[PDB]
Structures are given as structure tokens and as C-alpha cells.
Design a protein around this ligand. Structure first.
Ligand SMILES: O=C(COP(=O)(O)O)[C@H](O)[C@H](O)COP(=O)(O)O
Ligand SMILES: O=C(COP(=O)(O)O)[C@H](O)[C@H](O)COP(=O)(O)O
Ligand SMILES: O=C(COP(=O)(O)O)[C@H](O)[C@H](O)COP(=O)(O)O
Ligand SMILES: [Ca+2]
Ligand SMILES: [Ca+2]
Lengths: 123, 455, 455, 146, 123
């Protein structure tokens, strides 16, 4: 009988309960997006990588949901390598930031995916 | 309509059976499964269903001459035999837009289903489907939020959401109830839930439950960093009590409330739906009592009709049963009403029980909730059948884990994420489900423990 | 309850079938007609019904050890075969007082009937009767007024009350609708009525209808000197709209409003019932949609259960169907739930479908309303079957008279008074009904005209 | 609107139009902001108007404008105005944030220059070009438009 | 394509998006005030040089807008050198404070200018 840990066990939604993705796994998730005609985009956050409530408390209001966009969504991107190269540029510039890959479905007209691609040391 | 009076009984048939009728885009169409009494021919039965759910009177009345009743009558415009059933037919009936009160599901059901089911010429009657015209759809608010907005508020993407009903439903004190809630949420589930029966009772008054559940959910959210919710049941005896409950949930700043729409009723449900929209609260709908009406094939109303009504009145989630434990066909029927709940347009498809093409003119979709005897081994199946836009609920499947609620939650969250990753990599969930689960047990003691207990 | 955990499925049977159980006066008792799947023995089925409508879980959960589940479980304490039916039994189940929210019919139905009807081990299930303990009865308001107070407010004694549904239900303008109302009331009927479908629609908005109906009823009252009423339908899409309607009726000073309790729902009905008590309004309840649930003998809920629920939630009148056109037995069943609606105490009587002795501890009785294809010739029968405390409603039976509404009303009022006088003189309505009617035609041209048209 | 009430009001751009129409706009701009405006038919002001301390309204310049109109807008409207850039911001090649930086830098360069005594009307393009030397965001924008 | 930085990129309103002013540029901005008959004044803040919300949250209410006045507005000042000398005294005394120059227009009867003149190290 194991007791689920309490300290430093913050999660980042989809796929965050699995062992961290290898470059191959990461590339396979990116291909899923491309094959579905979804637009990939990267987001990073250096301050609080988790949800909190500072500016308001009414139902459905939370701070920390929006992170900052790395460049622009990658319209027309056809190669998972392009995306992963960007993840590298981003990590190079923000080695202290959490980085996640998100995707937009222009037909459903909504953001449709979001998975942590990089966590800074000790997370 | 009209007259040259002369009182007396008279006959339906010619007046209500209009096989030549071309339906209007503004008409509400109904598909009734009619089982006539022996000796009643099909045309006669169909005409009776139409007359009895609109203007048919048992004896001529002079006032009909003050209007044009043709403009108001229901019309049986088509009849077709049911295969593998003797003396059973599908009769299609058209109702003019003008018979209905705008925005009132209560009036829609009263008009179509309020009287016909007791007609003596019929042995049994079942409403299978309704085509709600877009001009009537526009008179309703629909879901307070709907699929797209819910995911955006919660910041949850690319996988089914996960919940857990707290058990035992009755018996726990508000505080022990909240303790169970915190242990479940901290393990990775997105929501916890009040049983449909949990309203306000001697051992656990509602306000105390709402309060401890709030403490538990905020603690789990702070620990995990992921947004959490607990479906706080607002179902009550009067509109006033229901509103008091919704108002306190608002005060607590929590994200979601719950209502048993059939036992509470459509009038109260529409009130709560409007309040949730105005206050930013998600609304989880429980279908308690549905089987009293939708179970038997020969009499009642099929659940797809009760699901359309809820999408109009309003709800963000609705229980749709599990597809597990049933043969195809029943699997196909479920997938059929799931499309009717989520999509903007669904084409007629008799193989899935969809009798009419249905458009929703951008009314938000409702998230279907799969619940009922499910555990980790059904995960590949559920993910395959429902896709991402669904809520999978595990009551016994979570609180029944040998190490407790938290590990029970971890097991379910890992099992789900393993399936999502596999599907995304192109693996076949239908063929490789058990292998996907087993591989995950290699690195998840929590999942391995669960897999040992069930199936 | 309790533990030494160890997760896993387990079996009901021993736990929920308690044939030795002695029921408490505080227990809510249910009589379910159970049709098990082939291979499921009766004790097993009864135990499933009890478990599935209370604490039965599909797999053991550790939290049961934090309470004493025995104190909360439903118990099947008796089973008896149904004669003339293979594999069909009546299973009696007891539910502890503590499972229910006080004053909430919504919670009572959710707890007993919210889940069991879909259990796979059952082929079909029907709730036949509920024994509501007096301690739970005391938590409800019951009828806003009830039989005794209604007669005192209206000053009407010694005969059934008479009403007439305005037809056609849809199509007339508010003013022509009111004209029909005035012509009916001035002829001797006590009430006129909105069809269950008449709420607020394109050709006749509710406020205009309420207003013209008020003018018509006041004019008929001033002309005849007898108090009149019109059941103004307050059924609406939301609680707020329903209340707006009740409030205007109050402003007009009229005596009675109406609500479709099943399509509106119990939560909204209880709100309207409380408002009527606080404002002195009588409440007429229409049972639209009942046959969707109560018609089939093997599945659903018998109407006697829906009638008890209404007496608790609240209503001054409730439609109970006609006893006409049916054989004894069905006649006996109706008379049985009529006693359950009107009396303070009704002893168990299986010949009339009364499975439990029921006490009401002075909760007011509800006036049953006989309606549906009746005319002057059924008068002796109706008076004999229902007695004085009933409302007899004639829609086509009034508006179908050859000389119009007023003479149609006179014919019904004379026919009823002739029967009452005859019964009071000791005449046998059952044997001399037709003779009593014929003698009255000798001095009533209106009645003679009606008698010529019907039967 | 100044009577009924509003803190900002759209007044169009003076860009893309000849003088006179430029003069007419400047005329109603004074009518929105000042406490007293003397009759001036050259600007379409038919009556002298006093406002007895009723607060002024901020005019909002909007409509097809981008970084190159900055010196002109600053010159024409002065400090008390709101300059709005829809396509001029969301149309920047690097995105919204750099689009915003380009506009904020362009505006501040003009304000600093004007304050130093530079003639925005004559030296506008030179003021913008000098800023591109140290602002990649501004340089990127300048390449896309005009 | 450059990504606008996220960390330590706090700004101080007017002129703060330009490279820091040289003494000559600074003097030229001060001459602008004098030539317009506006009264110069200095303000400093050692704690939070940016807007925040601690004491109230209603519309238009923010904390951190008021800083503390360095001496008094410089009525009658006719030489930019006077102003800049004061900036020096202030920096001497509060090397850890943000200092800004503001101006008042007594005719419009309002504060009319505000620009950061000094930022402590690492800002
Ligand atoms: O309590 C539970 C399930 O608990 P568990 O997860 O332990 O099975 C749900 O309310 C029902 O399954 C819903 O019924 P329906 O799906 O017929 O609406
Ligand atoms: O409109 C009528 C009767 O009109 P008419 O008097 O012309 O027959 C009543 O609402 C129904 O009979 C009630 O149904 P139920 O009795 O099943 O509730
Ligand atoms: O949407 C825009 C401009 O977008 P963009 O900045 O991309 O041009 C403004 O509302 C109009 O220009 C105003 O019209 P008017 O000035 O006539 O009121
Ligand atoms: Ca449940
Ligand atoms: Ca009716």
C-alpha cells in the first residue's frame, strides 16, 4: 500500500501523469495534431505554472490559465521537426520556463489540445 | 374548423391522416411507435394519434367555426410497418409552430405527449424522436455554457474528463464526505459528485455539505495545480430552496452545480439553467427516473427525446449510460443520441435510431457522462466509443481501490492518459486496449493494484 | 457498513432480503410489481430492488466502515406471487425515514424510483403503492385548501361541482375564448377551464386570456348570483413565468388557478402550492403525461402513487379519469385511489389496489375531477360512483349542445340536480338513472334537446 | 454625446483627406475637448460655444492607420487623443505583442522628438527611421507597411 | 521573429519604451516643460515602482499611483540645470529609489507630465 505523495506533485493536465515524453513520443503527439489538420503553437510561463486566484473569485474565474505565446501558431506547418526545433529555441531562451504545446482546430474554432513539453529543473 | 353546426359525434380518419402532406421547416415532427388494438387499421391509429395530440374532439363543437382548425391540427403524414413486430407501426406526425410556447419544454411535452398515451384504440405508444425546427430552437437558451466554453473555463484539453460519485450516498457526515472528496480529487480526477439522492437530509444538511466540499476541493486544487470541481446537488422541493442552494455555490466561487431534471422538473430546470448562465456556473444534469419512462420498447418515450429536451432547457453535462455490457445496435443507438447532444447537425440515420435530420443553429453541445459499473479495464473501450468530449465517472471504480481514493484516482487518470497517448500514436484501442493497460501497470503501482482487483 | 476492507465485488441477497423484518411506523414502504429476467429467483430480484434503490454498490468501498449502513439500507421484507402471471411478484420494501428530505416529493421520488427501473436483472418494474408514514406526512403542507374549505369559500353544498373545458384548445382569440366562458358559466356550470395545452402562445397570449376570462366570469356571476371560477392555467417554462401568472390571477381577485404538475414538475408545483395557500387561491391540477408512466401494468408507476404525491405537494382538485367505459375492478381501482385522495384514513384493500393502510393525520382531502367523453346520460352513474365530493367536467358535452353553451350548461346542471334530488329521495341511481333523466326532459327543453343528441 | 455623456468618442482619422476636411475635423475636436470655442467658419464652427466647465471628451482616431501615420496623428491630435490600431497591430508579422511594441515605440519616438523641438510635419519619416535602428519590432512593422 | 520578453520588463509610462535618456535628452525634456510654463517637480518611490491593488478593488481604484514628492514643485524655475541638480541630490539620498520628473500645468490646473528619470540598478 503506497501513499500518493503530497509535496512537489503539481501536474499540468493532459499527459502529465505519464512518464515524461521522449523526443520520439513528443514527435508522435505532434504528428497527431498535423494529421488532424490542427495548428500547433507553443506557450511558456516563467512565474506560476499552475492555476491560482488573485484578481477575482467568482465562478469560472481563475488566474494562471493563460501563458504567453512563443511566436505565432504554426500555420501550414507540415513537419513535426519544425515544431520541435521551436521547442529547442524556446528552451534555449527560457530554460527556467514551463513550455507546453497546444493546438488549434480552426474548424471547431477552438483551442483543442494542450500538453506539457518541458518543465524546468526540479519539477 | 368552420360550420353549419348540427351537433353530434362524427369520425376522425379523413382529417388527420394526410399522407400527401409536405412538412414545413417550421413544423415540429414526431415519430411515434404505435401498437394499435386488434381491429384498428394503421391509418386509423395514426389519425387517432394526430387528433388526440391536437384538435380532435369526441363530439362536434360550434366554436370550431370561429377559427381555421386546419392551421392548428396535428397531421399524420406517413406510416411505415415495424419489422419483426406484428401490428406495430411508426406514424409520423407534424405539429404547426404556433401550437407551442416559446422557450417552454414544459409546453412542448404537454402538447405532444400530454394526452395521447391513454387513448383506448391503442394498446401501447412510444415517442421515439422529435424534429425540433430551428425557429423553435432559437427560442431557447440551451446549455448555460456547453462543451467548448467548459473546456476553456477549466483549461482541460484532449482527453475525456474524469469524475467519481461519493459513496455511500447516505450515511456519511458532511465532514467525512468532504474528506472522501479531497482524497479523490488530489489523485487526478477532475470532479467528484453528489449522488442524485443527496439533497438535504437529517444526517447531512446541504449547507454543511457544500461548505466542507468547498474546503476539500480548494485543498485538492492547491495541491495538484489542476482545476477541480464537485457537482453540488441543488435539487430541492421548491424553486425557492433550489435557488438558495445555487446562490450559496455562487458565493463559494465554485464552478459547478447539479440538478435531477426529471424529478425536479423542466420548469425548475429552466430556471436553474438561466441562473447558471447569468452567474457562470456549469450545470451537471442527472437523469434519475428516466428508466421509468424510456426502458420499455413498446411504451413511454425513448431517451433521445429526453436528451433533446434537456439540450433545449439547458445543461452542460448529461448522463448517457455506458455502452459497456450491451450488444451493437444498443451501442449504435447510444452513439446516435450522443451525436444529437454534441453536434450542430445530425443527418437522419435509422440504423442509429435517428428518425429526423436535426439542426441546432449553433446551440452549444452537451457533454455526455458515462457512468455505471465501470473500472480501469473499460478505459480503452470508453475512450474509443465516446472520444474526448465525454465525462467518465467512477464511483465504486475509485472508492473501491485497495489503497484508497487517491491511488484509486491515480489509477483511473493514468489508465485514461495511457489510452489517449496510445490512440494519438495511432494504436488501435479496440484491438490493443488490454495491452495498452498492461504496459502502464509496469510503471504504475497504483494502476497495477487496480488491475489485480477487477476483471 | 463497517469493514476489514479488502476490495472486490461481493453479493447482495443476504443483506437486502429481510423476510423477518418488522416495519417501523416511521418507514416509507413500497410495493413493487417485479418481473425478473429468466433465471433470477424472486428473493434475488427483491433483494436487487432494495439494494438498487438504497445502498447497494457494485464493488465494496472502504467508506462504508465510517457509518452504520444497516440504519440506511432499503429492505425487501416480503414477497408474494402475482396470480395469473408467470414469473411476476409483489416485493415489499421498507425505507428508513432518514433517507428523505422533509417536504420534498422531488426527493421522495428520486430516492425510491430514481435508479431501480433500469436494473438489468429485471425485465420490467412497476411501483404500485407507497405507505407514507405520518411523521413524513407532517413535513408537507398538503392541499392549499382542500375539500371542506373549498366548499365553504364557494358556498356550494350537497352536489358534485360542474366544469367545462373550453374548446377548441388552440385557435380562438382571447376575446372569443372569453365569450365561450361567459356563455358556459351563465348556464349553471360552476367552472370553466383552460386546456392543459393553453399556456401562452402566438394567437392567445396568457395575460389577454386571463383578462377576458375575468370579464366573462364576473359577468356570469353577476347574472346568476352564484360564485363562478375559471381555471387559469399558470403552467410555464420557468418558475419566474409561472409566478408572474399566479400573481396576475391574485390581482384580478379570481378564485382558482391551474397547473400541469407532471410536465411542470414537482419542484415548481410545490412552489405554486405554497403561493396559493398564502394568497387564498384554489389550485386545480391537471395530470397531463400521466399515461406515459401509469398505463402499462408491467412497467412504470400506478396513478395511485402519483395521486398521493400530489396530495402531499399540494392541489385542491386532481383529474382522476372517468369510471365510465370500463369493467369492474378498474372501477374498483379508481374508487380505491379516490378514497386515498379524499379520506383521512384508508385501510389496506387488495381488491381495490390498496397495498398499505394509509393515514393522513388531518392533511386535507383533494377533490377528484371526472373528465373525458362524458355527457348528460352518464350523470346518474357519475353521481353514484363519485358521490358529492367530485367535479364533473364536460367539454364536448357542453360546447356540443345544439342550442349553444348556455343551454348546454343548463342541461348538465338540471340533469345533475335531478339525480341529486332523486338519490336524496331514496331512488336507486344505478337502477333508475335513465328514468330519472327522462322525467326531467319533460320539463326541461334544454335537457330534452341534449338527450336527443347523445346516446 | 458630450451632453448625454461619454469619456471617449470616435472622430475618424484626418489621414487620407485634403485640408478643409482636415480643418473640419480639428474644428469638432475642439468642440469635444475645450471649454470655449469661438465661431470659425473656416473650420465649420457656426456658433461660439461655451461649456461652463463640462468635462471634455477624448477623441479616438481609428481606421486603416499604422506606424507611418504616427507623426501625423501626434501632430494633428496632440496628446489628448486615443490612437487605435486594429489591423495595424494584429497584422504585425511577429504577432500582437511585437505589433504593440512597434506602435508604442513609434509613438514615444514622436513624442520625444516633438518635445525636443523637432518638426513632426517635416521630419516624421526620419524620426520613425531612426527608431527602427534600435527597435527590431518597429523595423519589422515599417517593412510591411507603406 | 523575436518574442517580447516576459521577465523584468516592467515599464514606467511615457518615454519608458525608449532607450534611457542621456543627460542632454533629459535636459531637453525639462526645457519642454519650462518653455510651456509648466512647473517641474520630482517624485521618488523606494517600495513598489508599479501599480498594484491592496486596499480596494472597485473601478478606477489602484494603489501605487502616488509616489512621494521630493521637496516642492519648482515654481519660477527657469533653468533645466536647477531641476537636474535636484535629480542628483535625490539620487544621492535615494540611490535605491525610482525617480520621475512630473510637471504641473496651473492653467489646466492638472498634473500634465510624468517620465522616469532614474531607475535603481537592475531595472
Ligand atoms: O451512482 C452512480 C454510479 O456509481 P458506480 O460508478 O459506482 O457505478 C450513477 O448515478 C448511475 O450509474 C447513473 O444511472 P444512469 O446512467 O442510468 O443515469
Ligand atoms: O380535454 C379534456 C376532456 O374534454 P371532453 O370533456 O370534451 O372529453 C380533459 O383534459 C381530458 O379528458 C383529461 O385526461 P385524463 O382524464 O386522462 O387526465
Ligand atoms: O474596427 C475599426 C477599425 O479597425 P482597423 O484599426 O483595423 O482599421 C473601427 O471601429 C472603425 O474604423 C471606426 O469607424 P468610424 O471611425 O467611421 O467611427
Ligand atoms: Ca448515483
Ligand atoms: Ca384537455
Amino acid at each position: 500500500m503506497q501513499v500518493w505523495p503530497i509535496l512537489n506533485l503539481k501536474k499540468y493536465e493532459t499527459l502529465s501523469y505519464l512518464p515524461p515524453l521522449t523526443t520520439d513520443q513528443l514527435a508522435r503527439q505532434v504528428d497527431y495534431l498535423l494529421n488532424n489538420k490542427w495548428v500547433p503553437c507553443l506557450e511558456f510561463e516563467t512565474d506560476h505554472g499552475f492555476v491560482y486566484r488573485e484578481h477575482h473569485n467568482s465562478p469560472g474565474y481563475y488566474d494562471g490559465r493563460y501563458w504567453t505565446m512563443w511566436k505565432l501558431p504554426m500555420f501550414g506547418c507540415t513537419d513535426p521537426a519544425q515544431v520541435l526545433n521551436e521547442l529547442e529555441e524556446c528552451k534555449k531562451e527560457y530554460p527556467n520556463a514551463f513550455i507546453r504545446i497546444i493546438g488549434f482546430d480552426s474548424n471547431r474554432e477552438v483551442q483543442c489540445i494542450s500538453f506539457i513539453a518541458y518543465k524546468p529543473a526540479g519539477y | 374548423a368552420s360550420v353549419g353546426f348540427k351537433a353530434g359525434v362524427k369520425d376522425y380518419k379523413l382529417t388527420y391522416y394526410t399522407p400527401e402532406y409536405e412538412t414545413l421547416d417550421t413544423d415540429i415532427l414526431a415519430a411515434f411507435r404505435v401498437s394499435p388494438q386488434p381491429g384498428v387499421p394503421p391509418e386509423e391509429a395514426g389519425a387517432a394519434v394526430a387528433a388526440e395530440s391536437s384538435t380532435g374532439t369526441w363530439t362536434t363543437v360550434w366554436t370550431d367555426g370561429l377559427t381555421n382548425l386546419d392551421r392548428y391540427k396535428g397531421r399524420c403524414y406517413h406510416i411505415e410497418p415495424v419489422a419483426g413486430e406484428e401490428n406495430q407501426y411508426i406514424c409520423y406526425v407534424a405539429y404547426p409552430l404556433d401550437l407551442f410556447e416559446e422557450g417552454s419544454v414544459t409546453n412542448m411535452f404537454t402538447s405532444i405527449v400530454g394526452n395521447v398515451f391513454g387513448f383506448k384504440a391503442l394498446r401501447a405508444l412510444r415517442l421515439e424522436d422529435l424534429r425540433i425546427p430551428v425557429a423553435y430552437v432559437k427560442t431557447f437558451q440551451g446549455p448555460p455554457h456547453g462543451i467548448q466554453v467548459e473546456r476553456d473555463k477549466l483549461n482541460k484539453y484532449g482527453r475525456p474528463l474524469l469524475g467519481c460519485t461519493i459513496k455511500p450516498k447516505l450515511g456519511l457526515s458532511a465532514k467525512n464526505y468532504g474528506r472522501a472528496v479531497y482524497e479523490c480529487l488530489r489523485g487526478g480526477l477532475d470532479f467528484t459528485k453528489d449522488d442524485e439522492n443527496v439533497n438535504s437530509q437529517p444526517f447531512m444538511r446541504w449547507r454543511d455539505r457544500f461548505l466542507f466540499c468547498a474546503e476539500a476541493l480548494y485543498k485538492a486544487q492547491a495541491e495538484t495545480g489542476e482545476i477541480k470541481g464537485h457537482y453540488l446537488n441543488a435539487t430541492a422541493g421548491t424553486c425557492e430552496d433550489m435557488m438558495k442552494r445555487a446562490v450559496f455555490a455562487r458565493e463559494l466561487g465554485v464552478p459547478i452545480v447539479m440538478h435531477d431534471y426529471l424529478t425536479g422538473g423542466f420548469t425548475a430546470n429552466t430556471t436553474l439553467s438561466h441562473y447558471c448562465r447569468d452567474n457562470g456556473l456549469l450545470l451537471h444534469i442527472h437523469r434519475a427516473m428516466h428508466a421509468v419512462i424510456d426502458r420499455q420498447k413498446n411504451h413511454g418515450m425513448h431517451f433521445r427525446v429526453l436528451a433533446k429536451a434537456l439540450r433545449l432547457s439547458g445543461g452542460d453535462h448529461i448522463h448517457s449510460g455506458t455502452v459497456v455490457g450491451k450488444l451493437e445496435g444498443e451501442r449504435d443507438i447510444t452513439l446516435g443520441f450522443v451525436d444529437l447532444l454534441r453536434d450542430d447537425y445530425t443527418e437522419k440515420d435509422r440504423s442509429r435510431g435517428i428518425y429526423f435530420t436535426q439542426s441546432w443553429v449553433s446551440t452549444p453541445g452537451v457533454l455526455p457522462v458515462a457512468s455505471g459499473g465501470i473500472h480501469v479495464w473499460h478505459m480503452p473501450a470508453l475512450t474509443e466509443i465516446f472520444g474526448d468530449d465525454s465525462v467518465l465517472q467512477f464511483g465504486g471504480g475509485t472508492l473501491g481501490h485497495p489503497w484508497g481514493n487517491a491511488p484509486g484516482a491515480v489509477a483511473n487518470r493514468v489508465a485514461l492518459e495511457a489510452c489517449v497517448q496510445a490512440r494519438n500514436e495511432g494504436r488501435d484501442l479496440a484491438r490493443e486496449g488490454n495491452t495498452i493497460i498492461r504496459e502502464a501497470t509496469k510503471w504504475s503501482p497504483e494502476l497495477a493494484a487496480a488491475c489485480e482487483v477487477w476483471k
